[PDB]
Design a protein around this ligand. Sequence first.
Ligand SMILES: Oc1cccc(Cl)c1O
Ligand SMILES: Oc1cccc(Cl)c1O
Ligand SMILES: [Fe+3]
Ligand SMILES: [Fe+3]
Lengths: 256, 256
Amino acid sequence: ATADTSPERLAAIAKDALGALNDVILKHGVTYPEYRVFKQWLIDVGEGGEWPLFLDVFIEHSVEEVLARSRKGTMGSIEGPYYIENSPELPSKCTLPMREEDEKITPLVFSGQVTDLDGNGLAGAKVELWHADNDGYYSQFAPHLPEWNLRGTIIADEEGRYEITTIQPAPYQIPTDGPTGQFIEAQNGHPWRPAHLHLIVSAPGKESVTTQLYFKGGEWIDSDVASATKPELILDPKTGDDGKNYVTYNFVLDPA
Amino acid sequence: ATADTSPERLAAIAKDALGALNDVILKHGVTYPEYRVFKQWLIDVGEGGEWPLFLDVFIEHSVEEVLARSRKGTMGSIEGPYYIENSPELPSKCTLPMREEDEKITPLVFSGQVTDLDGNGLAGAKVELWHADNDGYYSQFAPHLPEWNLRGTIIADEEGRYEITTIQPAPYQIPTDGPTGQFIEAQNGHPWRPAHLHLIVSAPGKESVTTQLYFKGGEWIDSDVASATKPELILDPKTGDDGKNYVTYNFVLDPA
Ligand SMILES: Oc1cccc(Cl)c1O
Ligand SMILES: Oc1cccc(Cl)c1O
Ligand SMILES: [Fe+3]
Ligand SMILES: [Fe+3]
């Protein structure tokens, strides 16, 4: 992993990042017992392997807020720690891989079209979906699950449309008996995320979008610990007489 | 290590610390290639065990600047990563433990008195000295050195005076082929400290002081990478006709 940044830019970055922190210590009168605790917690983050967690919850929102200024298409959001590459491909209309345990849960049917800025249909266009199960587990992040459970690469047809069936997600709680959750708990916070789909959407000759979609009445909707939920990405699914929840949603892709 | 801080205070602390950083990302337009690099570097700091180094160089100065508001005695400074407790005791006038390799170097003779705010003499009063050798190594931080090389606990007499002989320190360069030094080097900085004595000074019924002393014409004197050098802590040693450098310095101790 490399940035291709200059020493001039880094220097300016670190000066005000360090200036900022050093400024919070002065402003609040941070003591020496406090400093020791802090240092000890940074070691633990590393030792608990919680660096992508902590940063993704607490920092990635600004990185996407920056990228967000540059694009005219669908609203993006943070990737989070759990994306996996080359998930198995599925046809234009499909079901997401899932176990019998998953078959017990109210289904979600997710339809729409991948278009360009003008609104034209895009063939040979892909939707990478992934999200958590009713337990708040992600596959490849819990040994009891099959390695592509609720992950897939959806191949959109002739005109960019896709119809995808999966389950309807339940609120993810981030891990707590570790440094990130001890961080939240010592400040009387809450370790909850909204229920969400993660998606990378692409198509030839387009700047991909990475985003999330959420659910209209959901808990933790206006208190996302990751600060990653927007108005523009909240679905409002209607239920069929089959009893399955139904949503349509379209992705608008910028020029690459 | 425990602070005894409330959730209210921590919450306020983390809000503006996180707000601050998130504010630097927005201000500079930090990209996604940049973010990956950053995250990867935080893992390495941990994995290189460079957390007390990085923080002590870049952060501890504000913690002491805070404590500095509360005290009327000698000017303090940052401890740094290398203090060791219960170094062996020596009488009021002594020499610091050192090898034959150390005996080759111009000697430093360091005299003075530990007093109170009014200026009265303090018996049963201690000076913990430690510092680096002409190589820029600290004992217990390089396997080739004897475990108390240039460390000791000096026992001041009847009236708080001490006379201590050691070597005259050479400029410490912090480690470079690791994350902290790759941090400095990618921004065209310099990994140099001034030459310095570390000292903890105490006496019964007094708030100890932790500080450093530096040398009047030294290199890196106005570009200390740790930002830890003050005007008030720069010695000006005269050389004897024995050829040994001579300094007197007195420590003024606040009520505990
Ligand atoms: O499931 C998650 C866990 C932690 C952070 C984010 Cl952004 C997630 O989506
Ligand atoms: O020797 C040192 C190395 C790193 C930081 C400080 Cl403050 C030192 O004194
Ligand atoms: Fe998630
Ligand atoms: Fe030092």
